[PDB]
């Protein structure tokens, strides 16, 4: 033969895992005020955002 051994056909990952893992991240970061990169508040801005 010579075709006697071949890598087993594993599935690919899904496009959706990728994108939805995506959406959830932001949905946390909009239904709550948390953001892994963004600056926090201080008493001053709590009293005057300007």
């Amino acid at each position: 033969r010579q075709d006697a051994i071949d890598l087993f056909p594993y599935h690919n990952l899904p496009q959706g895992i990728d994108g939805l893992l995506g959406m959830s991240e932001e949905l946390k970061e909009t239904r709550t005020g948390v953001t892994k990169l963004g600056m926090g508040i201080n008493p001053d801005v709590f009293k005057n955002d300007n």
Binding site: T35, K36, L37, G38, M39, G40
Partner: protein
């Protein structure tokens, strides 16, 4: 303190700034209060006036 540019608005820096503020108010101040009483209650002390 660095509103020049280093505005500190990183959730990573603030989830750290929390832990040190815990160590301050649960830990360090109760060590000082702990001493100030212990000292205030025993021995004779001098001061280089």
């Amino acid at each position: 303190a660095y509103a020049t540019v280093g505005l500190m608005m990183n959730a990573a820096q603030n989830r750290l700034r929390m832990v040190c503020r815990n160590i301050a108010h649960n830990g360090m101040v109760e060590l000082m209060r702990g001493i100030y009483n212990l000292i205030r209650e025993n021995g004779e002390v001098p001061i280089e006036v």
